[PDB]
């Protein structure tokens, strides 16, 4: 039944985090952040909204959507790079 839709009000919340995540990729780590990560964030964001049976994407769902994708990307890095990235993304 549920096909939750995006709000353009959250465009800033999405684009700014992506650019911030991209900036740290060249700063530290060998894995370059790709557009497919952003494509993954929107998908899991839609899935989180689909959990609440709400037809529109909320800011709360995006925060948890950002948390899951960033955490997986950080945890897959080597130990030396892993500790640097955890401090840089303490907000997320």
């Amino acid at each position: 039944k549920i096909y939750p839709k995006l709000h353009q009000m959250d465009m800033d919340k999405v684009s700014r985090v992506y650019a911030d995540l991209r900036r740290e990729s060249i700063s530290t780590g060998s894995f370059p952040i790709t557009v497919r990560h952003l494509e993954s964030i929107l998908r899991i964001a839609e899935s989180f909204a689909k959990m609440r049976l709400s037809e529109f994407v909320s800011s709360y769902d995006l925060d948890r959507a950002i948390k899951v994708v960033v955490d997986s990307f950080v945890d897959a890095q080597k130990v030396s790079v892993r500790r640097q990235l955890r401090r840089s993304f303490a907000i997320y």
Partner: protein, 566 residues
């Protein structure tokens, strides 16, 4: 009653005039002088002479077109008397070729007109046209012109007749396969393939991969399984305002930049990559030396890209722009291993030569995706085709050479997660270095982190997910940032057909100075030809009669941006 039909066609051939010549009678006379028993008749002149005979042919060609063949045989016999076998009739028409998806039961046994590309041709076979038979019981001799022998003697038991081989005549038959033009292929749909058969002198006129126009007889032969086919009757293979439009466009000084931006406007950056693709589409020039050395005019480009750098989109856009383009990915090709093959079609039980993806693109461009993960033995045929423009196929006791004059657009993933500038490309790209030596220009599309570029890309994703991308197409068109894809495709065919530039002596000595100074610092002699092909590519875009030294700077720079990129 049928005598009037024979007489009507007799008068039509003998008396029709075009360019003050009795073209149908004259060409038949010329064929007799050449000693070939063929004739070609245009349908647009058949309707002009008399609509009645045209309407009868269009409605019931099953028995009327045999009458036309017999009538012209009488006409040829009459012609031979003045100068002191059954002749073939070929039909050509200029009417609209109805799409292959549109033929229906109402057109069964009616004259139809179609167009498509020939994907496969079969071996020749013998067919009977005139026979002489004798009764085994009473030795009664007679002649016969699906025909079957009489079950009872005409003078003896059932099936008394046998065939006299030394007093009979036979004709040649070829079976072919055709499918619709890729310009009309729907998305998510397999193109409609069609079975076509031709006989006598229409055989062996085409090779697989040829675009042709078809006029023939759509028919069906044998829970009630049935299969359609076409009895081939004839095969055929720019506006002044458009010619002058591009001629005026040739004098536009900003044409190079305008065309560059039109190449995938939805993508950001990679401006010089767009210029290379234009040079790939424009291509170089081919020349033949008297000593047997043929110069490859095709230009091949490799796009080494990191994952997520829109490498899939780069090749995807080119296929819709290039007039002759085919997309290949994961060893997948036009029902073949990228090359020609011999396969047996069970419908006619015959063996057919089938053209692969690189076969269909003779004189065009091919897009190869996932280049690093293809079959190595396929690379060898590609390697020969990339340099000698030929594909070699061996079957049992015969070896055949097939022409493939195709430019190659290739994209590949490096050995590691990203190309490392500290190493030569031969230790970074994930396939054979021998092929790496064959590409004219290779580029590494980059993913340098930039704020405005990433943000603009990021918003583009949400726009698609919000449906605003459809409105973006109108916004981009209103901005005038792109030439129409159909018009650009027309232009590529236009320049490929109208212009063939040559290098100027000043450009040549400029190239010599550049090459010597490069090697003084350091590149092979093979890549000298690759650079020169670019010089002809720029001149062809401008349709200049000769190349100019002002083309050299961009040609050197683009190649410098390619080879020194790695």
């Amino acid at each position: 009653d049928n005598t009037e039909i024979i007489k009507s066609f007799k008068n039509f051939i003998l008396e029709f005039r075009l360019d003050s010549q009795f073209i149908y009678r004259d060409q038949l006379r010329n064929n007799i002088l050449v000693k070939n028993y063929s004739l070609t008749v245009n349908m647009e002149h058949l309707i002009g002479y008399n609509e009645d005979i045209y309407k009868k042919l269009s409605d019931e060609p099953s028995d009327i077109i045999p009458l036309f063949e017999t009538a012209i045989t009488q006409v040829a016999k009459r012609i031979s008397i003045l100068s002191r076998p059954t002749f073939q009739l070929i039909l050509n028409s200029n009417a609209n070729q109805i799409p292959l998806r549109d033929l229906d039961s109402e057109h069964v046994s009616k004259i139809v007109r179609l167009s498509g590309i020939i994907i496969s041709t079969s071996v020749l076979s013998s067919r009977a046209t005139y026979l002489s038979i004798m009764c085994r019981n009473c030795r009664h001799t007679t002649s016969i012109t699906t025909v079957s022998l009489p079950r009872s003697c005409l003078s003896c038991g059932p099936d008394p007749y046998i065939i006299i081989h030394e007093s009979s005549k036979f004709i040649d038959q070829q079976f072919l396969k055709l499918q619709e033009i890729p310009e009309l292929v729907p998305v998510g749909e397999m193109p409609r393939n069609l079975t076509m058969t031709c006989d006598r002198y229409l055989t062996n006129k085409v090779i697989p991969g040829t675009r042709v126009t078809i006029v023939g007889i759509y028919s069906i032969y044998n829970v009630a399984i049935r299969t359609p086919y076409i009895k081939i009757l004839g095969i055929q293979s720019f506006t002044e305002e458009e010619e002058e439009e591009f001629l005026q466009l040739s004098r536009n000084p900003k044409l190079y930049e305008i065309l560059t931006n039109s190449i995938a406007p939805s993508i950001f950056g990679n401006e010089d990559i767009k210029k290379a693709i234009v040079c790939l589409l424009m291509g170089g020039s081919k020349k033949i030396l008297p000593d047997g050395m043929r110069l490859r005019g095709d230009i091949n480009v490799l796009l080494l890209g990191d994952p997520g750098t829109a490498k899939s989109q780069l090749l995807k856009f080119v296929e819709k722009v290039s007039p002759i383009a085919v997309y290949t990915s994961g060893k997948g090709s036009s029902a073949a291993g990228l090359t020609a093959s011999v396969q047996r079609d069970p419908m006619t039980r015959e063996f057919y030569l089938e053209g692969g993806a690189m076969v269909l693109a003779d004189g065009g461009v091919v897009c190869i995706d996932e280049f690093d993960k293809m079959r190595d033995e396929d690379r060898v045929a590609i390697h020969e085709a990339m340099e000698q423009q030929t594909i070699s196929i061996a079957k049992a006791g015969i070896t055949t050479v097939l022409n493939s004059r195709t430019s190659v657009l290739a994209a590949a993933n490096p050995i590691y997660g990203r190309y490392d500038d500290l190493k030569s490309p031969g230790d970074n790209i994930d396939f054979q270095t021998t092929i790496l030596s064959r590409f004219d220009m290779i580029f590494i599309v980059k993913d340098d982190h930039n704020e405005e570029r990433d943000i603009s890309i990021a918003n583009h994703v949400i726009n698609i997910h919000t449906g605003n991308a459809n409105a973006m197409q109108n916004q981009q068109e209103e901005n005038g940032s792109e030439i129409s894809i159909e018009k650009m495709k027309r232009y590529i065919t236009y320049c490929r057909l109208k212009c063939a530039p040559r290098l100027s002596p000043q450009a040549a000595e400029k190239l010599s100075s550049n090459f010597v100074t490069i090697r003084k610092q350091l590149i092979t002699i093979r890549q000298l030809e690759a650079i020169i092909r670019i010089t002809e590519s720029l001149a062809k875009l401008e349709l200049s009669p000769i190349a100019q030294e002002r083309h050299v700077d961009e040609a050197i720079r683009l190649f410098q941006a390619s080879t020194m990129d790695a």
